[PDB]
Write a protein that binds this ligand. Sequence first.
Ligand SMILES: *[C@@H]1O[C@H](CO)[C@@H](O[C@@H]2O[C@H](CO)[C@@H](O)[C@H](O)[C@H]2NC(C)=O)[C@H](O)[C@H]1NC(C)=O
Ligand SMILES: *[C@@H]1O[C@H](CO)[C@@H](O[C@@H]2O[C@H](CO)[C@@H](O)[C@H](O)[C@H]2NC(C)=O)[C@H](O)[C@H]1NC(C)=O
Ligand SMILES: CO[C@]1(C(=O)O)C[C@H](OC(C)=O)[C@@H](NC(C)=O)[C@H]([C@H](O)[C@H](O)COC(C)=O)O1
Ligand SMILES: CO[C@]1(C(=O)O)C[C@H](OC(C)=O)[C@@H](NC(C)=O)[C@H]([C@H](O)[C@H](O)COC(C)=O)O1
Ligand SMILES: *[C@@H]1O[C@H](CO)[C@@H](O)[C@H](O)[C@H]1NC(C)=O
Ligand SMILES: *[C@@H]1O[C@H](CO)[C@@H](O)[C@H](O)[C@H]1NC(C)=O
Ligand SMILES: *[C@@H]1O[C@H](CO)[C@@H](O)[C@H](O)[C@H]1NC(C)=O
Ligand SMILES: *[C@@H]1O[C@H](CO)[C@@H](O)[C@H](O)[C@H]1NC(C)=O
Ligand SMILES: *[C@@H]1O[C@H](CO)[C@@H](O)[C@H](O)[C@H]1NC(C)=O
Ligand SMILES: *[C@@H]1O[C@H](CO)[C@@H](O)[C@H](O)[C@H]1NC(C)=O
Ligand SMILES: *[C@@H]1O[C@H](CO)[C@@H](O)[C@H](O)[C@H]1NC(C)=O
Ligand SMILES: *[C@@H]1O[C@H](CO)[C@@H](O)[C@H](O)[C@H]1NC(C)=O
Ligand SMILES: *[C@@H]1O[C@H](CO)[C@@H](O)[C@H](O)[C@H]1NC(C)=O
Ligand SMILES: *[C@@H]1O[C@H](CO)[C@@H](O)[C@H](O)[C@H]1NC(C)=O
Ligand SMILES: [K+]
Ligand SMILES: [K+]
Lengths: 358, 358
Amino acid sequence: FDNPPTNVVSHLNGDWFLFGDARSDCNHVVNTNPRNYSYMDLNPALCDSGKISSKAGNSIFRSFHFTDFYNYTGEGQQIIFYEGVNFTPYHAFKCTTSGSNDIWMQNKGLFYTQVYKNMAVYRSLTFVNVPYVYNGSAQSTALCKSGSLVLNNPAYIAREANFGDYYYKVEADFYLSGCDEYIVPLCIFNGKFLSNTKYYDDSQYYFNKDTGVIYGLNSTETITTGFDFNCHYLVLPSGNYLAISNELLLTVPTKAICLNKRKDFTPVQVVDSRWNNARQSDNMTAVACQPPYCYFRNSTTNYVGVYDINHGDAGFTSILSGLLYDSPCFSQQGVFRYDNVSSVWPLYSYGRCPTAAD
Amino acid sequence: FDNPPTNVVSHLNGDWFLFGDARSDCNHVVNTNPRNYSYMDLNPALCDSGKISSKAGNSIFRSFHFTDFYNYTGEGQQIIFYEGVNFTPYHAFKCTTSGSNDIWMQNKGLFYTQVYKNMAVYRSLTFVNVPYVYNGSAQSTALCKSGSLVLNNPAYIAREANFGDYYYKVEADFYLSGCDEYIVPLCIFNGKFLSNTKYYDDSQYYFNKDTGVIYGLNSTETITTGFDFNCHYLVLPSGNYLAISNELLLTVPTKAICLNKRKDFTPVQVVDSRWNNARQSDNMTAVACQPPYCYFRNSTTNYVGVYDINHGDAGFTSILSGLLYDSPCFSQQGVFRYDNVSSVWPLYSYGRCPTAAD
Ligand SMILES: *[C@@H]1O[C@H](CO)[C@@H](O[C@@H]2O[C@H](CO)[C@@H](O)[C@H](O)[C@H]2NC(C)=O)[C@H](O)[C@H]1NC(C)=O
Ligand SMILES: *[C@@H]1O[C@H](CO)[C@@H](O[C@@H]2O[C@H](CO)[C@@H](O)[C@H](O)[C@H]2NC(C)=O)[C@H](O)[C@H]1NC(C)=O
Ligand SMILES: CO[C@]1(C(=O)O)C[C@H](OC(C)=O)[C@@H](NC(C)=O)[C@H]([C@H](O)[C@H](O)COC(C)=O)O1
Ligand SMILES: CO[C@]1(C(=O)O)C[C@H](OC(C)=O)[C@@H](NC(C)=O)[C@H]([C@H](O)[C@H](O)COC(C)=O)O1
Ligand SMILES: *[C@@H]1O[C@H](CO)[C@@H](O)[C@H](O)[C@H]1NC(C)=O
Ligand SMILES: *[C@@H]1O[C@H](CO)[C@@H](O)[C@H](O)[C@H]1NC(C)=O
Ligand SMILES: *[C@@H]1O[C@H](CO)[C@@H](O)[C@H](O)[C@H]1NC(C)=O
Ligand SMILES: *[C@@H]1O[C@H](CO)[C@@H](O)[C@H](O)[C@H]1NC(C)=O
Ligand SMILES: *[C@@H]1O[C@H](CO)[C@@H](O)[C@H](O)[C@H]1NC(C)=O
Ligand SMILES: *[C@@H]1O[C@H](CO)[C@@H](O)[C@H](O)[C@H]1NC(C)=O
Ligand SMILES: *[C@@H]1O[C@H](CO)[C@@H](O)[C@H](O)[C@H]1NC(C)=O
Ligand SMILES: *[C@@H]1O[C@H](CO)[C@@H](O)[C@H](O)[C@H]1NC(C)=O
Ligand SMILES: *[C@@H]1O[C@H](CO)[C@@H](O)[C@H](O)[C@H]1NC(C)=O
Ligand SMILES: *[C@@H]1O[C@H](CO)[C@@H](O)[C@H](O)[C@H]1NC(C)=O
Ligand SMILES: [K+]
Ligand SMILES: [K+]
């Protein structure tokens, strides 16, 4: 008898949910010709399960920030993630041509940190639009963009006619409702921002009108180039808020991650989402995935897909294969198929776990 | 054979530490006459261990906020707490005679929440003085006090000579060094605060000069009585900060909980700290003590001490008795003395845990 920790994602019972991308997007097949499921790492037998929310070409972070939006939606006791690759150093995203992808990688890590931590204590994740009211005559403006990627959360509001510089103070009202908690971005350009001969230091506050909490960020960088849009990811309660800009452009949330249905602490499972080695990936989801709230799974091999080089890999297919059955014990080291005896002590475990005793 | 979960605090190996009060203060005995150890729930055999930091009449919260200060100091992999009673509804603390003990109970809960969460990931806790510089000629003033309890953290700075009201903006610089992280209070009077015929709305911000993060609290209550000093407990990095007051009195930290030596996630153990039923206690440490970061232990009986009615209880002596030996498995349900087989599945477990399988 053998009960080793196994390198899979699985589930204790039927109460689970997976968020993903093309590699687990059953619907994508309609856009293959001829129709072919080999682009998937997920087993197509799971296509009717109702336990998957995935979109080819997307990721939760990508949908959070950009106009390229998929309404990821799901509920379960155990949450599993196999997405992230659709925002990587490969995309070379920066708000401006003299920006920094490293900043955006930092943003990515901070975002997934909050997602993973919160999905260990909430059953349900979806996206909600955040309504806001701005009183001026200025409209929103797409200041942050690169190729096909256009930032739309937070929104930037243009300067009013009457102002000749960016030293002004303006505000908008944004209202959070419908969820137990909300993940929203609070961001600034952290750097010396040149506009019409003057260098600015972006400043943005959010204010909960009823709790009275102020969350703010002021620019502190002294560099005049190679800077970008630094974001923090706030986990906020329902309420009515002001977004108060003290310098540069007013920014306000337009989308939130909607967290609902508090649950007993249940660690999430995260699968490394990367490209074939020919493309630059990042380890930000690994950084974000820590005990006790998350188990991280990765293959030992290069991603080499059979459909194309970036889709349908033996290693990741193996990892996802655990979704085809129930497993009793989840641990840092892997999943144990039996709940009785093992040769190693499971670490940070969840479920019915074996003893490594005599 | 029998391996039930047991209602004790214990330790996996010798790497542990206990924070407490008189009920575990070996030194107190010098202040008994004749000398008598029966005031303790801790076994005196542990008096030479070097693994206890306790002071009769004190608590970590009490020392955090008030002039009645004990420098709680300790390091261990597994941290245990048996303190809190020395700040309870019994003490009837309020900043003013028309204040609110309920507010202070809320403060207590919020504080212990941060302590317990952080001591699951740091080995070391102590107190550090927080130096600050205020530029005015005004001195500190003890605005919040009740009987023998006098608040000294945060400090209040009096108004300057030149000001005739409390609508002013002033600041101090405070510097955090020597620790990985710091717990500091950010507080305001949350209410309509009457001074010389005018009603004020307290406002206080802290600003990290290098990260550029602003943490602020503004008063939102409309009541003119029955309000008090609402605190939030920030977990901050080393750095140089400004305390920026926008209304009422400037407040600034004078003491921090010093968190050092990051460790692998290890749940803390907390023992209910209460008075005999003749006195009003509270459940704020229970509220603060949640999975997966904390296990809470409580006796099933009234606290009835043998030394006096509030010292030396059979139930709590029993709970602490587990410190006299090593135990392999810690769980929500209790401590299992054996790592092999049990009849229940340990929940949120830490250590070498038994299987409830056939
Ligand atoms: C954060 O940045 C804002 C905007 O720069 C600061 O507010 C401005 O501060 C300068 C003083 O250096 C004044 O000249 C402006 O009038 C202020 N603008 C406002 C209030 O809209 C703000 O003080 C910074 N917050 C801090 C340091 O906590
Ligand atoms: C938090 O409270 C402060 C102090 O009341 C507010 O700052 C004052 O706001 C009033 C406007 O209602 C002005 O009359 C004062 O001049 C301001 N004092 C200052 C800036 O020192 C502040 O706006 C509040 N913060 C919010 C609402 O985010
Ligand atoms: C109009 O040309 C410039 C300028 O020098 O003013 C070029 C300037 O480009 C620079 C400095 O590399 C751009 N600022 C930034 C940080 O990208 C700056 C801004 O895009 C532009 O001023 C609008 O700024 C705001 C705050 O909306 O535009
Ligand atoms: C001087 O008498 C009074 C006053 O009406 O002004 C009584 C006043 O007592 C009240 C309103 O119950 C006190 N304010 C509060 C909230 O306790 C108030 C303050 O203690 C005093 O004004 C000092 O206030 C500040 C901000 O230092 O003092
Ligand atoms: C996403 O889908 C959920 C479920 O249908 C819905 O409640 C929510 O409003 C949607 N969010 C959008 C479209 O932003
Ligand atoms: C992520 O990558 C950096 C190197 O770029 C490394 O320092 C860090 O340890 C990595 N973290 C994880 C969790 O793999
Ligand atoms: C995943 O494993 C592959 C192959 O060992 C390795 O190249 C890669 O760095 C790992 N990814 C992370 C995020 O650790
Ligand atoms: C599906 O794609 C795989 C991998 O490219 C290929 O071997 C196979 O011919 C395809 N099947 C069909 C029916 O096109
Ligand atoms: C462990 O469980 C497996 C599967 O039921 C079984 O083959 C083996 O005998 C068990 N070992 C025990 C109970 O010691
Ligand atoms: C508390 O004790 C520790 C250890 O001796 C010391 O480093 C620290 O400065 C003390 N804190 C005080 C006295 O505020
Ligand atoms: C604390 O006491 C209140 C009643 O005052 C109760 O609602 C709450 O559930 C209690 N919490 C715990 C953890 O015992
Ligand atoms: C501890 O147990 C006692 C006796 O059952 C009970 O009265 C008390 O409410 C409990 N305390 C907490 C914080 O639950
Ligand atoms: C210690 O106190 C206990 C409980 O009050 C009492 O029974 C005993 O007489 C005391 N012992 C001494 C030596 O005073
Ligand atoms: C459990 O361990 C105890 C103590 O060693 C022993 O008495 C008992 O036989 C063990 N049961 C097993 C190994 O099934
Ligand atoms: K801004
Ligand atoms: K203040």
